């Protein structure tokens, strides 16, 4: 407790003796409250992307994303000790299976800085960026002095910043990817490793990935949200993530074993109150990380309830008060005998899910999932889950998939969402001090990425290609990422769906965008699109005036038409 969080507690304190009020007015209940001191980023629209989607600045869905808790201050109870024998055994077995052609490893400074020179989102806080701290000898000091006291099993600067993200300075960042960033860089959650898991999978294999799935014998396709995933992790759900420490040794055993101990089964935040003073609150349980180490960790613990819940459904347990001995010795044979062909059968991305069971008999198995904690989003909790029956209609990392048949025969799965969402997420940049020439690079980015995923929709391919003629061919796209590069989208289409794509047998390379198809229009405006409305017939037929305008702000530069890839501008 206090002999674990006290020292990061009195540094604070010491650095504002002065203004520290222990006020008797906190509003905090599940949360541990020591004291406060005195203190004192909005959506931005990206202006070629929006001069380039005019139709869409009368839709409220599109234009209302641009404009302008009771979770985090709530209390998990302890699971029973059938469902926490139930998790043990699961997680003890599926480090193991993770582990089996895997070496965990420590991740380097070199590795750290590299990272950091390539701008990557580290949730961080003398030096104004890391790109300075990460090349001056002294920061390098201070990450020894913490890492030699975490050697000690002792914490002093590994404090979060609550904003929900929990940003570190750069230094504890370092600490936890020396000791966790493996999971990540070695790409444990890899389907190949993990059967699970879709860690470097783009959006051109979800699909698939799911419609593998479907071909397995079994019930309808479960796709449950929890509610408030990162609040619902317990105390018991960070102890069976500890135990990848067991497949560890020396150095790295000790330094992963303190990042457990230290910072996530005791955590310690800073959070502005209005009322501005900084509140410095402690808890135990909940999920605050790194938000690439909380992938990894949520991803583990999400293919562990899953497995329990298919346990509970083909009737491997009887009741979550207690397991008998013989109950756990069918529940380890289940695992070695099954386990894998089980695994196989589910899509996780940390706490996203999709499961196809054995049988229905999963969509009234809640006991050990409610006990877990791991309660389900908009539904009530003892009410059975409604399962799909058709691959295409499955929600799943914010898309669903179609089916799309190419006019030679071949099959390509495409991802999908209404498109007020992918048009109005374009029209946004964050932060400020942008450019004129890094707004454009942003919105061919945008571009780029719906000529290589969304090319299905006829209004994303027709602004596509209007953007990719707006900005300068040889400007480069700034903030898997296949569409992040100056090489011709036609080429890198045709390695992404024909080359590089295992489900197709025949390599023949498409020659033009016309060979690539479209959704049929129907499912194409029931998808969101304009097609069929005036606005967006005045706004196809008029594109090179819009185009001509972005072009005249821009001033003059090097412009490619892209426009006469499509057949209506092809003469
Ligand atoms: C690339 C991710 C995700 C992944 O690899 N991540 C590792 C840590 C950050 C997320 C895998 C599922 C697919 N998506 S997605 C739908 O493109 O956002
Ligand atoms: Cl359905
Ligand atoms: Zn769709």
């Known amino acids: 407790n206090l002999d674990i969080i006290g020292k990061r507690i009195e540094k604070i304190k010491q650095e504002h003796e002065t203004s520290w009020h222990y006020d008797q007015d906190h509003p905090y209940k599940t949360w541990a409250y020591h004291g406060s001191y005195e203190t004192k980023a909005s959506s931005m629209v990206n202006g070629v992307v929006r001069l380039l989607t005019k139709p869409w600045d009368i839709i409220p869905m599109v234009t209302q994303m ?10 998990t109870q302890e699971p029973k000790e059938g469902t926490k024998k139930l998790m043990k055994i699961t997680a003890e077995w599926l480090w193991k299976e993770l582990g089996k052609k895997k070496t965990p490893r420590m991740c380097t400074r070199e590795e750290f800085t590299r990272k950091v020179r390539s701008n990557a989102a580290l949730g ?19 990450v020894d002095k913490e890492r030699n006291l975490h050697l000690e099993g002792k914490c002093e600067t590994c404090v979060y910043n609550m ?10 960042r370092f600490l936890e990817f020396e000791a966790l960033g493996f999971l990540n860089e070695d790409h444990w959650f890899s389907r190949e490793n993990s059967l699970s898991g879709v860690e470097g999978e783009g959006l051109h294999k979800l699909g698939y990935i799911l419609r593998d799935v479907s071909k397995k014998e079994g019930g309808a396709m ?76 949520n991803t ?75 309660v389900r989003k908009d539904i009530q909790q003892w009410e059975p889950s409604r399962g799909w029956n058709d691959w295409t209609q499955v929600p799943f990392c914010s898309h669903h998939f179609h089916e799309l048949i190419m006019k030679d025969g071949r099959v390509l799965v495409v991802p999908c969402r209404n498109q007020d969402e992918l048009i109005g997420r374009a029209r946004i940049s964050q932060g400020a001090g942008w450019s004129l020439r ?43 990422h ?10 890198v289409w045709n390695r992404v769906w024909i080359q590089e794509n295992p489900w197709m047998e025949d390599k023949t ?25 005036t606005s967006r017939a005045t706004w196809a037929k008029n594109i090179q005036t819009a185009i001509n305008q972005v072009r005249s702000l821009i001033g003059n530069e090097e412009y490619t038409d892209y426009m006469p890839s499509m057949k209506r501008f092809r003469r």
């Not at 904003?163 to 504890?172: E, K, Q």
């Not at 005998?337 to 008999?361: F, T």
């Not at 390379?509 to 069929?532: A, F, H, M, N, T």
């Open 509 to 533: 390379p498409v020659e033009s965008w016309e060979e690539i198809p479209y959704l049929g229009k129907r499912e194409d405006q029931w998808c969101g699109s304009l097609i069929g409305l």
């Open 124 to 142: 961080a806080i003398k030096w104004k960026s890391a790109r300075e701290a990460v090349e001056d000898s002294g920061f390098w000091e201070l």
């Open 300 to 374: 583990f613990t999400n293919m562990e309830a899953q497995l329990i819940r298919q346990m509970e459904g083909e009737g491997v347990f009887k009741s979550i008060q207690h397991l008998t001995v013989t109950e756990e010795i069918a529940v380890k044979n289940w695992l070695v005998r099954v386990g894998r062909e089980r695994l196989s059968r589910m899509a996780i991305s940390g706490d996203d899910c999709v499961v196809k069971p054995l049988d229905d008999r999963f969509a009234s198995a809640l006991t050990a999932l409610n006990d877990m904690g791991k």
């Open 222 to 297: 479960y796709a449950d949200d929890t509610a408030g995933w990162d609040t619902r992790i317990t105390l018991e759900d960070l102890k069976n993530e500890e135990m990848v420490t067991n497949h560890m040794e020396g150095e790295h055993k000790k330094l992963a074993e303190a990042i457990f101990k230290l910072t996530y089964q005791n955590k310690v935040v800073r959070v502005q109150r209005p009322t501005t003073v900084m509140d410095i609150i402690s808890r135990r349980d909940q999920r605050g990380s790194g938000q690439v180490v909380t992938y990894g960790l």
């Open 482 to 491: 296949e569409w992040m590069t100056t090489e011709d989208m036609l080429t």
């Open 438 to 480: 890094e707004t454009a690079c942003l919105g061919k980015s945008y571009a780029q990425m719906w000529s290589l995923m969304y090319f299905h929709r006829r209004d994303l391919r027709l602004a596509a290609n209007a953007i990719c003629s707006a900005v300068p061919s040889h400007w480069v796209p700034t903030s898997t």
């Open 66 to 75: 641009a404009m302008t808790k009771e979770k985090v201050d709530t209390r």
């Open 163 to 172: 904003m929900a993200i929990w940003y570190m300075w750069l230094g504890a």
